[PDB]
Amino acid sequence: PQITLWQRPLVTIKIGGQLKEALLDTGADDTVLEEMSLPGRWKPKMIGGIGGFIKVRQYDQIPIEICGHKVIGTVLVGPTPTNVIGRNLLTQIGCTLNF
Amino acid sequence: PQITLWQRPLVTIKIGGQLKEALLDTGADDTVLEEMSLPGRWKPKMIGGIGGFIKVRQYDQIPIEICGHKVIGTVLVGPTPTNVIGRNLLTQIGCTLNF
Numbered sequence: 001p002q003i004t005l006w007q008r009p010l011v012t013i014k015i016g017g018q019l020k021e022a023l024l025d026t027g028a029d030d031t032v033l034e035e036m037s038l039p040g041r042w043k044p045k046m047i048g049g050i051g052g053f054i055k056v057r058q059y060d061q062i063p064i065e066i067c068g069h070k071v072i073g074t075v076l077v078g079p080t081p082t083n084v085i086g087r088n089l090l091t092q093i094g095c096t097l098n099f
Numbered sequence: 100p101q102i103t104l105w106q107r108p109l110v111t112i113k114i115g116g117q118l119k120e121a122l123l124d125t126g127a128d129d130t131v132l133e134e135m136s137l138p139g140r141w142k143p144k145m146i147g148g149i150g151g152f153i154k155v156r157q158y159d160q161i162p163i164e165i166c167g168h169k170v171i172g173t174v175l176v177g178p179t180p181t182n183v184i185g186r187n188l189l190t191q192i193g194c195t196l197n198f
């Protein structure tokens with residue numbers, strides 16, 4: 001699809017069996033999702049953004065379907081206001097910026 | 100261009116004669132920059148990211164050049180670790196997310 005940016009680029013994602021909404025963010029190196037129970041062992045880590053650092057639980061090799069397209073990669077879980085799909089996953093659906 | 104996301108989408112931006120680099124951020128509503136010592140009045144405001152909130156100064160009608168594309172828009176100046184071209188300016192250059 002071609003998504004114009006007049007409004008926030010929110011798309012449907014399916015993770016851990018549930019449908020959620022997530023923001024396609026080209027400015028995020030990583031994927032950060034709101035609190036949720038995920039399978040497997042996690043590692044504590046810290047990522048930084050505009051207002052500083054937050055603590056996150058890192059899950060590796062998690063499968064996610066972004067608008068029907070399957071991807072598998074690291075997912076960081078923590079106190080984020082909203083789900084952010086980052087470059088680590090965007091590259092897997094062949095997502096590109098065009099102008 | 101059609102830009103892939105294997106590395107941060109950094110581009111050249113010219114503003115007030117000064118050349119700089121900024122991140123094409125589809126996850127940012129606004130364009131946020133380091134101090135650009137811009138002339139004119141501004142309005143203080145708060146914006147947030149991952150990690151908390153920051154205080155910025157809002158400057159409207161700023162002539163800015165992005166990849167040879169000339170646009171005019173609101174620039175928010177403040178303590179951001181990196182320059183961000185948000186959707187307010189990404190739309191002005193006809194930028195879309197595609198996959």
Ligand SMILES: CC(C)(C)OC(=O)N[C@@H](Cc1ccccc1)[C@H](O)CN[C@@H](Cc1ccccc1)C(=O)N[C@@H](CCC(=O)O)C(=O)N[C@@H](Cc1ccccc1)C(N)=O
Nearest residue numbers: 027028029030048049050126127128129146147148149180
């Ligand atoms: C998620 C990780 C992996 C940590 O990456 C970044 O945060 N990368 C940031 C760039 C950066 C790199 C290095 C250092 C510093 C900054 C992007 O801006 C991330 N894009 C979104 C992520 C996001 C979206 C939604 C909620 C939380 C976080 C963002 O910060 N967007 C801000 C950018 C600033 C701006 O546009 O004004 C935004 O849209 N803020 C809105 C929406 C908002 C409001 C309240 C709270 C949170 C967000 C606002 N009006 O303040």
